[PDB]
Amino acid sequence: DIAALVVDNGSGMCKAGFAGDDAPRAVFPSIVGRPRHGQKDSYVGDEAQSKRGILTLKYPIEHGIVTNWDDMEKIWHHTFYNELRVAPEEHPVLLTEAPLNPKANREKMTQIMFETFNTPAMYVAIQAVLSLYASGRTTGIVMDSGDGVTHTVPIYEGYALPHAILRLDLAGRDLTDYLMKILTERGYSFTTTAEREIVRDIKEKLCYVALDFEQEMATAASSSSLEKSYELPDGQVITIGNERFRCPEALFQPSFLGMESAGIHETTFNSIMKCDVDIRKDLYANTVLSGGTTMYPGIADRMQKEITALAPSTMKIKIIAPPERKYSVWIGGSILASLSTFQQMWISKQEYDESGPSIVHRKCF
Amino acid sequence: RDLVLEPIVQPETIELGMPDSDQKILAEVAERENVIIGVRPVDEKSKSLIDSKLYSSKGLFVKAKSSDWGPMSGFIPVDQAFAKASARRDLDKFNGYAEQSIESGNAVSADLYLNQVRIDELVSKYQSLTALEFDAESGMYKTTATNGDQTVTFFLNKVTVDSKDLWQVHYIKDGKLAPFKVIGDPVSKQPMTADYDLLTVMYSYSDLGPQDKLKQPLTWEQWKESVTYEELTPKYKELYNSEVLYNKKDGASLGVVSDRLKALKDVINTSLGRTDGLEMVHHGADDANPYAVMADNFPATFFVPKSFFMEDGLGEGKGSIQTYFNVNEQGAVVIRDPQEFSNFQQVAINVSYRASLNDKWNVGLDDPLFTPKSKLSHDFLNAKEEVIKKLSGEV
Amino acid sequence: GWNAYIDNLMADGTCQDAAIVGYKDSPSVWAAVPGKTFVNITPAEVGVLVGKDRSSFYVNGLTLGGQKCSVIRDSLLQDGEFSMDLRTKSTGGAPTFNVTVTKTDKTLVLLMGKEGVHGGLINKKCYEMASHLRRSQY
Ligand SMILES: Nc1ncnc2c1ncn2[C@@H]1O[C@H](COP(=O)(O)OP(=O)(O)OP(=O)(O)O)[C@@H](O)[C@H]1O
Ligand SMILES: [Ca+2]
DSSP, X not given: OOOOEEEOOOSSEEEEEESSSSSOSXXXXXXXXXXXXXXXXXXXXXXXXXXXXXXXXXXXXXXXXXXXXXXXXXXXXXXXXXISOOOTTTSOEEEEEOTTOOHHHHHHHHHIIIIISOOSEEEEEXXXXXXXXXXXXXXXXXXXXXXXXXXXXXXXTTEEOGGGOEEEOOOXXXXXXXXXHHHHTTTOOOOSHHHHHXXXXXXXXXXXXXXXXXXXXXXXXXOOTTOEEEEOTTSOEEEEOTHHHHHHHTTTOGGXXXXXXXXXXXXXXXHHHTSOGGGHHHHHTOEEEESGGGOOTTHHHHHHHHHHHHSOTTOOOOEEOOTTHHHHXXXXXXXXXXXXXXXXXXXXXXXXXXXXXXXXXXXXX | OHHHHHXXXXXXXXXXXXXXXXXXXXXXXXXXXXXXXXXXXXXXXXHHHHHHTOSOBOOSSOOOOOOOSHHHHTSOBSSGGGSOSSOHHHHHHHHHHHHHHHHHTSOEEEEOEEOHHHHHIIIIISOOSOOOEEETTTTEEEEEEESSSXXXXXXXXXXXXXXXXXXXXXXXXXXXXXXXXXXXXXXXXXXXXXXXXXEEEXXXXXXXXXXXXXXXXXXXXXXXXXXXXXXXXXXXXXXXXOHHHHIIIIIIHHTTOBHHHHHHHHHHHHHTTOOTTOOSOTTOOOSOSTTOOSGXXXXXXXXXXXXXXXXXXXXXXXXXXXXXXXXXXXXXXXXXXXXXXXXXHHHHHTTTEEOOOOHHHHXXXXXXXXXXXXXXXXXXXXXXXXXXHHHHHHO | OTHHHHHHHHTTSSEEEEEEEEOSSSOEEEEEOTTSSGGGOOHHHHHHHTSSXXXXXXXXXXXXXXXXXXXXXXXXXXXXXXXEEEEEOOSTTOOOOEEEEEEOSSEEEEEEEOTTOOHHHHHHHHHHHHXXXXXXXX
């Protein structure tokens, strides 16, 4: 009838494709490559990565929220015309927004979609809501840690409760800087951007969650049985020990970095305590992990343990870790715009021409 | 308990076809990298040549067909008429491809030398050469075999070649016995063996990454302009230096090749300890190409992660199972048929893997079987059907 | 009367309940759908809606005509917005419903959606009617 386009947004990456399908058709880093000063510029994606040595890179979003709209439009041009190669005026478009996106922002999203691409219809879905849609659930608490922001988001009947939303400006890139730093302190020398991407790959390949951090630190101090080696492209090999779990321990103790901030477990709990007493039980039983930084082995069990230690002895604690959750969000978007019930959910070009952008504040929640 | 054992026995036919030592190595790669690795069938003379480790193998340029009988099935003949599967017009196109290779100098035409251990395999183990007998008129032992459905006559000369008593094969053209020829490697002037063709390679969503997934036809100017002279992966520096090696490596691999598979080809060719451009996955091996003709694929084989096969109860969903598929020893797996393959994929995606697909498999078979959008969807969307049931409680 | 507007807003079958309640001075139900929930809402609940403590009802919830609801969005005190969004609360998997309160110059417009009707339709209807009444100086 129409495959509506699914267009996710993120601090580091983008995911795009057709609604009604199991995985994104297309993905890219959302950055844009201007010249260094010119006709032959290639603005987007893998081409911009490839040319990155002679180009100037920019990020339109920082801490989930769009900034340079001008080149977000360029990213949309590359998504619609280059990756899916389908006329986006011809299809309704599903859009995604970071939590707490400023009002005027969502109006500008609407303006661009309706005035520039003449989309017949659209919807804007909060990423965490898609993540809860992604596996069996309409109500629950999402712990969404991506590249920019970390959010704890209780959701009732598919509606995030902004009053109880807590935000933590701590994510993977700060951990990357930290891992480079403490890897040098082990006797190594990680300092370049190439080295940053290598440390990123090490973190992605080797970190895990210790159940007893102090005991594990003792084990690592008393032997090398958990230490690993990693071979650099220059074939040199570094070794990593307790850092494997010291890195993600920072999720629970940001003081390891000199930060005076609660761990994710305690902020999840405080989020729960901000919510209606009567729905917390279900929230307690629907703790959902999303984002690439939640892919560490052992995080669910450890969270279970920490909440159990903190929560009433009566409280039932359930940690849900969907196994591809690093992209579960996009699945949810495909689902949402798939539905017949969605027919009412379409924003129409006509509604926008008649009533203007502020309908989005009334209609889109 | 035959019900599983026949499923075991049919894999034994590929285990005859394909060496278990390589199944060991590639199972270890399937452990080390969390991926499914498919491979097409190869057959026992391919076992003989693989055990030789002696020669290069078929590629993309040498589009001539893996031959269909006997010694020659070991190789590709200079005339596809001795490689009879599919029909005349196709073998004529393949002779076209041969003539193209010959004019390009990416194939030479080469003479065929066999040693008694190979004959003993072919007669004794392979049951596929008929007993030789000396003819003084040919000065050769005559032999015969059903290359097609036709039995054909061949005359074999015992000759001191490389100081071994090789058999050199000969055949009658226009009533005159001429030495039989196969495709030779332009570099080593030695006969190209069949390759390994590959079938789908499947990865978890946990490494779904566009810098790896994307398929990219291009060649030299686009590559060398695209990457700055130190956005380097070491061998690529030679791709700055030489257009020829780029045209060999990427142009033959180019296929519709994904960059992940381009890196993995280097990994696998290293791991198999071959050298000097010797390989078994030079083809780039997608079965996304338009000529992924289906019946060539069978019986197929895979390597899968050790963790893979202990994951949950049988009977996943409407895709259902009770006998755990055509399992094979040495950690390998086999499959007989597209329905078995499609079920095996449907389970793998239920291990959150992502299936590569191509319409030609369905077009080969003319029943609706490989649409992802409809058919090959994984049962977490059946779980979204349960989500809509919840909404039906809402709705 | 105000019931003509209750009748009008209920006609399309998307909503199961509607009402107009005065919130100034001492609140009182000016008009409501007979035989439903909103007709029995009390003035004290209105006082809570327009009161200074905008935090306790997040943790304790509230009831409207005995139906428990949770506040999702609050723009009820913002000029140009004048709306609060809620959803009902149920036990044992019983359906929940979307609620919209809009605030005009003199009245509160309240709407309860049916099963599965998304809150945005109710919100659009209520806001457009509210805008029409403000335009009428109400
Ligand atoms: N194997 C891995 N292990 C741990 N973290 C990973 C792994 N792979 C990717 N990541 C992290 O996942 C993050 C990107 O995930 P994702 O694309 O969901 O974030 P995003 O949506 O762009 O961020 P935000 O939600 O703040 O906008 C990065 O911080 C990256 O470092
Ligand atoms: Ca994001």
